Amino acid sequence: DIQMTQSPSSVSASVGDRVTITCRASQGISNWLAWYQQKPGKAPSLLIYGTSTLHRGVPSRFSGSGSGTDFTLTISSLHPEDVATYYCQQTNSFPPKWPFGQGTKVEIKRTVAAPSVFIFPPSDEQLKSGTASVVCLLNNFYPREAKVQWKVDNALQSGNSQESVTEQDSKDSTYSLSSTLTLSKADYEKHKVYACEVTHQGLSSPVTKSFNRGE
Amino acid sequence: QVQLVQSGSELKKPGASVKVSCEASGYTFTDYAITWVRQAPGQGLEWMAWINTNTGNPTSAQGFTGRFVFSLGTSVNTTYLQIRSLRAEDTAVYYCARLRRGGYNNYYMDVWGTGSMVTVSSASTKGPSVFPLAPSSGTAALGCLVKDYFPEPVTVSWNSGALTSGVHTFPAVLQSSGLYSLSSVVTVPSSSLGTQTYICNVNHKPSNTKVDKKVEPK
Amino acid sequence: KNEQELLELDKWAS
């Protein structure tokens, strides 16, 4: 069957860079191709239709070119608000085959920014229910790669924590990360010192945030 | 005011059926066709079908016939999608969009609905527990932990939407319990922590759960 | 205004 091969699957470029995304059709469907933008946590929106025509409101940095089976999307200058995943699509009528491109994830390259680290002890309400969640927050850092190590009374922890990362901010191009250590109340009350060690390129040496129970 | 409004999130057992709606607003519903697009969690877009808002004959891709029924109701300003024999692969967000015809094989969607998330599971709905992430550490951080809920999604706002700058609501995380958990955080002036109140408004429609948790220093 | 009808016509393009 027909299918759209979209490349690159993802791209990282600096602000003001020229970004080019291509979409190849395994067979000729038509000379017309549509480009869609999906921002994080948002529905897709129309960028370009007819291979070149901008939808109203789309900035002129967005360009569309191609014919036959090869089509390209060009972003003149990578704005910070352009963080999104972009999809191509061709639409055949007689057979109902409207394949989408597999998608290209566009992220930005900015100067290194170290994280702000915050540690939150569990609430007394949660402990009253028998569980303890200790949250380690890394705020507004770049690049995404970062190591968060939980240490309880200086014993490295593994298998009892989970991380969650926001998508790149559309204004500062820096991410945020939460690491949550989940323990039972009995295990939580068995130790005094709880800390998370953050290692990141923007930090000259590893950073440790800790707390002792009680206050 | 030109928008498409879709029904809410749904939880359905395998083998059951779900019917999601899409109502046209700000424009003539029967002037343009309506198409449907699917997106599995973490996956790309997959076109499903388009329906003639005048006649009602759908046009679907091979994998979306018979089990999927696109229909138009007595209402002039709604089209509907129904999945029967809901299977695990049907768990996804289903988008409604207005279909445009730039020419032969020059079809494009200019207006998109907000999407309807459908989860397929025999489990029952469970509302989250909301706990404070109290500020303790020239700025301060605080938040709300929304824990042990099912299915997606949860929406979190601060001060009834009045607080947006500095807000980070992290993606939901799936726990070993099969329940979701997420945290919403906001950075605020460290000197305002004793004079300005901060409330997070967590809403979970599938369980009809609404919570307002005030976050203050211990 | 009559854009939908053209869509069904495009299918008979054989």
Boundaries of CATH 2.60.40.10 in chain B? 3-120, 129-215
Residue B43 amino acid letter: Q
Q: State whether A94 and C11 contact (CB < 8 Å).
A: yes
Q: State whether A93 and C11 contact (CB < 8 Å).
A: yes
Kindly report the number of other CB atoms within 10 A of residue A194's CB atom.
24
List residues in chain C touching B: CB distance below 8 A.
Answer: 1, 3-4, 6-8, 10-11, 13
Reference A169, options A59, A81, A48, A60; nearest CA is A81
Which tokens sit at B188? Answer: 């605020």
The resolution in Å comes to 2.4
Q: Among the residues of chain A, which ranges form H helices? A: 124-128, 185-188
Give me the DSSP letters along chain B: --EEEE---EEE-TT--EEEEEEEESS-TTTSEEEEEEE-TT---EEEEEE-TTT--EEE-GGGSSSEEEEE-SSTTEEEEEESS--GGG-EEEEEEEEEESSTT-EEEEEE---EEEEE-SSPPBPPEEEEE-----EEEEEEEEEEEBSS--EEEEGGGTB-TTEEEPPPEE-TTS-EEEEEEEEEEGGGTTTS-EEEEEEEGGGTEEEEEEE---
Residue A114 amino acid letter: A
Reference A175, options A9, A3, A12; nearest CA is A12
Q: State whether C1 and B53 contact (CB < 8 Å).
A: no
Q: State whether A93 and C14 contact (CB < 8 Å).
A: no
Q: Which CATH number fits domain B3-120: 1.10.10.10, 2.60.120.430, 2.60.40.10, 3.40.50.150?
A: 2.60.40.10
CATH code, B129-215: 2.60.40.10
The CA distance from B110 to the nearest CA of chain C, in Å, is 14
The CA R_g of chain C, rounded to the nearest whole Å, is 8
Among chain C residues, the shortest Cα distance to A95 is held by: C11
Helix or strand holding residue C9 (H, E): helix C3-11
Domains, chain A, ordered by start: 4-109 (2.60.40.10), 116-212 (2.60.40.10)
Residues B20 and B94: their CA atoms lie apart, in Å, by 9
* Contacts of B among chains (3+ CB pairs under 8 A): A, C
Identify the burial level of B120 via C-beta atoms within 10 angstroms of its C-beta, where 0-12 means exposed, 13-18 middle and 19 or more buried. Answer: buried
